[PDB]
Amino acid sequence: VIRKFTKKNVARAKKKYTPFSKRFKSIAAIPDLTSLPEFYGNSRFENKLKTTQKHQIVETIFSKVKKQLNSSYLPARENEFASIYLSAYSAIESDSATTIYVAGTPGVGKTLTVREVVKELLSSSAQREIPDFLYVEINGLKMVKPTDCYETLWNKVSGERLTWAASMESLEFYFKRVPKNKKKTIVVLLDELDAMVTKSQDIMYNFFNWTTYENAKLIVIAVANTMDLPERQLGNKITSRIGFTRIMFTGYTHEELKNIIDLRLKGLNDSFFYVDTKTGNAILIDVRKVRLRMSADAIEIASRKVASVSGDARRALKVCKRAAEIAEKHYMAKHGYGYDGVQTVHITHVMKALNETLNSHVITFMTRLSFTAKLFIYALLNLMKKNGSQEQELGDIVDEIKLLIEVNGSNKFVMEIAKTLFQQGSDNISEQLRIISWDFVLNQLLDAGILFKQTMKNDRICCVKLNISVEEAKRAMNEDETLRNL
Amino acid sequence: NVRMMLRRSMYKLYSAADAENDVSYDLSLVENFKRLFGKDLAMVFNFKDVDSINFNTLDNFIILLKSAFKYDHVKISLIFNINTNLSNIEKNLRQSTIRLLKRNYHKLDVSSNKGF
Amino acid sequence: DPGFGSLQRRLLQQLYGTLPTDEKIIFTYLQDCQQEIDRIIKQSIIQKESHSVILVGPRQSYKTYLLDYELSLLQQSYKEQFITIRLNGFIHSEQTAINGIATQLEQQLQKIHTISSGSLTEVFEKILLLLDTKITVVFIFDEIDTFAGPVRQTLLYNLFDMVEHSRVPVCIFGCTTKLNILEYLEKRVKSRFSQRVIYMPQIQNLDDMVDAVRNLLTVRSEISPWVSQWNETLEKELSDPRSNLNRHIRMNFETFRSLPTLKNSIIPLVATSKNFGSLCTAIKSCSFLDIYNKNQLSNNLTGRLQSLSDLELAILISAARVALRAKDGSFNFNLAYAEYEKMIKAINSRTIKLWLKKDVKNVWENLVQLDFFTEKSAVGLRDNATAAFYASNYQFQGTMIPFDLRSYQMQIILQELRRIIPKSNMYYSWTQL
Amino acid sequence: NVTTPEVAFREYQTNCLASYISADPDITPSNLILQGYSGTGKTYTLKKYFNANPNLHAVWLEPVELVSWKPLLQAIARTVQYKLKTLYPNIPTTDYDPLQVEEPFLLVKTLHNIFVQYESLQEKTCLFLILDGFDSLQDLDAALFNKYIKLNELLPKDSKINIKFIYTMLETSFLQRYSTHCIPTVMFPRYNVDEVSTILVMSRCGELMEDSCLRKRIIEEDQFQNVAANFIHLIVQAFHSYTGNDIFALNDLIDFKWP
Numbered sequence A: 001v002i003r004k005f006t007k008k009n010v011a012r013a014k015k016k017y018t019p020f021s022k023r024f025k026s027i028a029a030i031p032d033l034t035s036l037p038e039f040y041g042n043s044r045f046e047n048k049l050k051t052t053q054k055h056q057i058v059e060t061i062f063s064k065v066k067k068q069l070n071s072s073y074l075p076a077r078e079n080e081f082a083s084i085y086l087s088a089y090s091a092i093e094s095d096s097a098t099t100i101y102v103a104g105t106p107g108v109g110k111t112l113t114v115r116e117v118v119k120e121l122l123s124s125s126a127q128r129e130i131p132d133f134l135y136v137e138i139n140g141l142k143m144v145k146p147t148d149c150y151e152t153l154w155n156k157v158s159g160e161r162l163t164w165a166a167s168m169e170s171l172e173f174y175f176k177r178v179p180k181n182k183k184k185t186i187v188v189l190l191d192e193l194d195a196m197v198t199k200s201q202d203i204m205y206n207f208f209n210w211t212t213y214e215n216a217k218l219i220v221i222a223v224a225n226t227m228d229l230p231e232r233q234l235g236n237k238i239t240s241r242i243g244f245t246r247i248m249f250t251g252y253t254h255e256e257l258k259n260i261i262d263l264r265l266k267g268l269n270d271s272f273f274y275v276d277t278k279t280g281n282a283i284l285i286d287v288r289k290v291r292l293r294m295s296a297d298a299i300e301i302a303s304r305k306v307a308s309v310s311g312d313a314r315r316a317l318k319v320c321k322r323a324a325e326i327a328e329k330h331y332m333a334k335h336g337y338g339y340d341g342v343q344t345v346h347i348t349h350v351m352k353a354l355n356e357t358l359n360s361h362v363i364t365f366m367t368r369l370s371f372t373a374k375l376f377i378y379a380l381l382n383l384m385k386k387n388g389s390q391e392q393e394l395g396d397i398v399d400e401i402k403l404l405i406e407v408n409g410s411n412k413f414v415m416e417i418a419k420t421l422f423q424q425g426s427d428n429i430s431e432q433l434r435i436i437s438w439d440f441v442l443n444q445l446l447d448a449g450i451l452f453k454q455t456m457k458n459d460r461i462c463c464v465k466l467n468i469s470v471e472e473a474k475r476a477m478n479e480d481e482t483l484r485n486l
Numbered sequence B: 001n002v003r004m005m006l007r008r009s010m011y012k013l014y015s016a017a018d019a020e021n022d023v024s025y026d027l028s029l030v031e032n033f034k035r036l037f038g039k040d041l042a043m044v045f046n047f048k049d050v051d052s053i054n055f056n057t058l059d060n061f062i063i064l065l066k067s068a069f070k071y072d073h074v075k076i077s078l079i080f081n082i083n084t085n086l087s088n089i090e091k092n093l094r095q096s097t098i099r100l101l102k103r104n105y106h107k108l109d110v111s112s113n114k115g116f
Numbered sequence C: 001d002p003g004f005g006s007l008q009r010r011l012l013q014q015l016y017g018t019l020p021t022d023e024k025i026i027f028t029y030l031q032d033c034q035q036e037i038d039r040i041i042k043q044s045i046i047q048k049e050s051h052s053v054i055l056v057g058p059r060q061s062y063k064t065y066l067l068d069y070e071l072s073l074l075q076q077s078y079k080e081q082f083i084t085i086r087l088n089g090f091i092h093s094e095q096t097a098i099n100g101i102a103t104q105l106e107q108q109l110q111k112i113h114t115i116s117s118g119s120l121t122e123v124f125e126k127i128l129l130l131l132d133t134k135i136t137v138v139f140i141f142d143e144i145d146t147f148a149g150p151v152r153q154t155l156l157y158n159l160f161d162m163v164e165h166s167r168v169p170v171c172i173f174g175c176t177t178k179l180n181i182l183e184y185l186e187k188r189v190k191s192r193f194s195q196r197v198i199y200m201p202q203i204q205n206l207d208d209m210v211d212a213v214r215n216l217l218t219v220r221s222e223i224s225p226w227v228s229q230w231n232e233t234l235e236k237e238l239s240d241p242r243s244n245l246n247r248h249i250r251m252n253f254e255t256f257r258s259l260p261t262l263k264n265s266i267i268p269l270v271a272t273s274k275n276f277g278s279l280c281t282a283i284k285s286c287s288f289l290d291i292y293n294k295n296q297l298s299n300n301l302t303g304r305l306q307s308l309s310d311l312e313l314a315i316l317i318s319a320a321r322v323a324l325r326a327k328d329g330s331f332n333f334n335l336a337y338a339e340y341e342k343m344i345k346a347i348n349s350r351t352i353k354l355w356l357k358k359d360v361k362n363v364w365e366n367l368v369q370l371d372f373f374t375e376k377s378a379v380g381l382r383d384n385a386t387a388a389f390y391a392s393n394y395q396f397q398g399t400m401i402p403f404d405l406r407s408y409q410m411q412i413i414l415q416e417l418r419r420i421i422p423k424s425n426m427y428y429s430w431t432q433l
Numbered sequence D: 001n002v003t004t005p006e007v008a009f010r011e012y013q014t015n016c017l018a019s020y021i022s023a024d025p026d027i028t029p030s031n032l033i034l035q036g037y038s039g040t041g042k043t044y045t046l047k048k049y050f051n052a053n054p055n056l057h058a059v060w061l062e063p064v065e066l067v068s069w070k071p072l073l074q075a076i077a078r079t080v081q082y083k084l085k086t087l088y089p090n091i092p093t094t095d096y097d098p099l100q101v102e103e104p105f106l107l108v109k110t111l112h113n114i115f116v117q118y119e120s121l122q123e124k125t126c127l128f129l130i131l132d133g134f135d136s137l138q139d140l141d142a143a144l145f146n147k148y149i150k151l152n153e154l155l156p157k158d159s160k161i162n163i164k165f166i167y168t169m170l171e172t173s174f175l176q177r178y179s180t181h182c183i184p185t186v187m188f189p190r191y192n193v194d195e196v197s198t199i200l201v202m203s204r205c206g207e208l209m210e211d212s213c214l215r216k217r218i219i220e221e222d223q224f225q226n227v228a229a230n231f232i233h234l235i236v237q238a239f240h241s242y243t244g245n246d247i248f249a250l251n252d253l254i255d256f257k258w259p
């Protein structure tokens, strides 16, 4: 058979098609799923990434501060912890089904406190105060396809691998018809729910609908970045019909961020260290004893700057880590140390680490361009000063460049550079319609994002706009000693 | 477009050659024709309703088929079903394409009105 | 003699940067940036910290060069401590990046001592099982702006989560030309990013370019008898402020400010020399640089104008006259021919053969083909393959009307033709209205 | 270590070709562009250079026959495999299916799998992939050439076989879209009337003087070359204003008006 096209790289998973409604003859024929070694979960790739080191690492006194300010390593989230914990505990002890929607901006401690509530629930179930439950964590931004959540959750429930539609019918039949005495309670963390709802609202409506079933024994914790995601993905009738718990996560204040930072630094500040003077390795208590500190006002202004802009813990922790890294860079450069009295992280280190975030490189990039690129930007600024359109044709820029060269003939620099600009300093080269490196600087300003150019194959009538603002361009061209006097 | 013309032409060519291992439906089927099937190739293109095909596409397809002239086992014949007249056709084709088509062409009045 | 061949080969390998790592040339104005990059990699492969950092700079600003030199520096001392996964934003799509990561992981783990088997869901789950002392995984992401699209930024989210939370040491080097790269990221992605942005250092003064040329062309190993004399000839030409070499370096500094642009001209100056005296004469004169610069401009709108015939030039001038008189700059074949025929009639009244319409059609097609004319409001060459596919299935209105009625616009205006056409040409007086 | 042949008005282009194209991969650029309009002798000069250096390993692809990007990738994989097994017949290789290449990443993977089985070679070699007419591709989006510039970065640098790309393109504006990449580019400017006349004489006088109609005319009733050259200059003097500097159009007019 002669084919019209070929698909030669099809890789298909060995996933079955038959849903759970056909695994048994009747609803009364289903055994105890808790007493089954494939149900409810009743990582071999670590040794791939393993090797042996030859030389010992020199662990500098600041590397403790850097390692201990990582996001991988619950002050201020007590009402949220209490609310999620009492909703989940009350629904678990009553063998009911509930759903808690948690919203907020990134980095405010949403996933962390939901996980801490879940571990506290697991510890209480270890003391047999509440019945046992399965914990499933489903992240919408960790998927190839949004329907794979259906494949994931059922695989955590039954242990078998199905396709997503059959998994959806299996989960529907599990939460609807399977009796409560033959099943276990399930707590689902639906993180990044906006990643799974972009195409359509099937996953949102299915997961919220399963908690309305009397047989479900299902706890769904759904975490998102906007508050009106259920109100705009489902109607108000549906959201009134489910009745989810609604919890917002406001950004941290500066005092809360400060307590977070020095609770990360509780055992390290104002502490002693035995430091090897020839290598720089430090051991927490030929050897010098060095005290280490971070000042209070540095953390204070860092947490004050973060709480004004974003209020998230990740930025505050990362500027503290960057300040410690800057201090350790200067320390290692001063003492000549390698990789294999009082040491302080100062206010100026936090200032510099914040200034790398605060400042922009647009003006600095534009002041170090060539004369032709600055000529292009100056001609563009002259054109938007004259006709006031904010989009200029490229031919108008060419004519404005030609006019600026022709007018300033008495200037020493323009007289010295015009032969370069229109003949590349050579008498065998004819006078060109464009300047030398015209398309080079046009492509460079388009690649940098300074410019925007429309898609048009006529090079004269094609339009170009500044993609930054007019004031950084004015500040850049007034820095140049050539452009600012003409 | 020219891509669909070439893909349909090479699918029909490969199907007709197989009728009496998959391949790419492009002009490398033409250059590899004697390596696969062992015999020489004579393609006869019949363009139906030439007054209806977009002439830029047809010009680019003729320029595409010009690339097969460097293969010694290929000859190409073109049949144009002209409905209006020949002067209306050559005013829509580019002059280099007309110079290409001028080397050997034959006109044939195929109307039922001719001679009654 | 083999000595000049050895010296020419050494100059060519120094210009292409294909020396070994111990002999590799690093420019002074780059060195601090190199040291900063040298810090971050040394905090990942040796000290097992996790880093994410984006290098921002223009094309040919030595991002890939410095990253490759750092990796090949670390490869000769710690080869069992890290693996390298490299992705490119042009080649890898959102689907094929996962397959590329898995394939590169399985070969790089077999180069020290399956993830890539199955569907995309299974492969991505196995990758997250692998990633989300220990071997450092170093990711080199070229054109990282293409994955920071207005679409779910799934891969950047997962890579930055591997940076923050994973027990595997992970170092990401993104590379971009966009100065506002932080605005491209979604909030969750930006929050998970370390906000360590290295802007690549620019050439600030002419002595930076002079020192870089001195670094590129000085042979610092005695592998030829001509090495010392070539070095002192080089130092004499680079020390003279009025030499031809300093003039060309100043010219590049004011126009391109690009050392690779200068290397592309210096390479066939060295490679076309036949002996040592010819090479010394060529570096004294730099006449080959002028010939090179003349060749690089030979197919722009100036050199294409001088290749036209007098009938082609007459049709171009007539079309420019009609386009200048038109309100929107549009013209067609009929208006241009009418202007041309009244122009030949007014010249012959004060002899020139007037060509017919059928012959002027070929000249018109040749002027369209040489990009002197352009179809009105034509987009031209589309940005991406999807837009080109959408355009290729559309039937444009210009392709069905007869050729004499198609609207066209000039890529060169009448004033530019008056600038370029010499005074002795017989159609120069019609470049004014 | 290379031979620079004689091309009649392309001496600078041949010298640049000798300066850039070499059998040693350390002194050879990854990408080389030859830019010129139609009939400027790009194919002629490149063919003369590669036939003057038979030790250079070149693979010729014309992308006007492939139309789209996927057949171009498949043709690259197929022709690279074919050239390697007719170049090294004593190296046992697995014949990879070129139709499995449906993505640029798949081309990278397939080329890596092709090149790892030639590591038994002694010296590092060059594979010259000549994409004669890249911008003659019919679909031709802007983002395609950027995939081919950066293709060598994804392939192993210490491999025995290194792929070198030589691109031929027509339009100046297409080339000027990629000016910041600083790829070495050799320009082929359009010939003048004298150069066109000399090229037409040297390429068509031997075919005109040995034609069947002329030798039938001398029997019905150096100087044959004189009358063929005189016809060529008469055709040029009559029709240079009409054809411009087009070699092909003047060749058609010569072929039409010779009998």
Ligand SMILES: Nc1ncnc2c1ncn2[C@@H]1O[C@H](COP(=O)(O)OP(=O)(O)OP(=O)(O)O)[C@@H](O)[C@H]1O
Binding pocket: A070, A071, A072, A073, A074, A075, A076, A077, A104, A105, A106, A107, A108, A109, A110, A111, A112, A113, A225, A260, A313, A314, C188, C191
């Ligand atoms: N209250 C807190 N106490 C201590 N550390 C915190 C706190 N809140 C956040 N952090 C730190 O900041 C990190 C970010 O928190 P988390 O992952 O819970 O944020 P999130 O609100 O879920 O963010 P996103 O929307 O980006 O996923 C945590 O991993 C932790 O290291």
Ligand SMILES: Nc1ncnc2c1ncn2[C@@H]1O[C@H](COP(=O)(O)OP(=O)(O)OP(=O)(O)O)[C@@H](O)[C@H]1O
Binding pocket: C016, C017, C018, C057, C058, C059, C060, C061, C062, C063, C064, C065, C066, C068, C142, C176, C177, C260, D181
């Ligand atoms: N691995 C390498 N070995 C030798 N020279 C190299 C290497 N990588 C790049 N170069 C050279 O370094 C110079 C700078 O180009 P490079 O590719 O490093 O810039 P870039 O900023 O990474 O570019 P782009 O943004 O276009 O990817 C060029 O002349 C290039 O040929």
Ligand SMILES: Nc1ncnc2c1ncn2[C@@H]1O[C@H](COP(=O)(O)OP(=O)(O)OP(=O)(O)O)[C@@H](O)[C@H]1O
Binding pocket: D007, D008, D009, D010, D036, D037, D038, D039, D040, D041, D042, D043, D044, D045, D170, D199, D202, D203, D247
């Ligand atoms: N320098 C030359 N010496 C002799 N003949 C030449 C020369 N240049 C061109 N020709 C002749 O003109 C023909 C056309 O040249 P060629 O095909 O190389 O041009 P091109 O620029 O590659 O064209 P295109 O853009 O159409 O592919 C050649 O096949 C050859 O017969």
Ligand SMILES: [Mg+2]
Binding pocket: A110, A111, A112, A191
């Ligand atoms: Mg979270």
Ligand SMILES: [Mg+2]
Binding pocket: C063, C064, C142, C175
């Ligand atoms: Mg790069």
Ligand SMILES: [Mg+2]
Binding pocket: D042, D043, D044
């Ligand atoms: Mg050619």
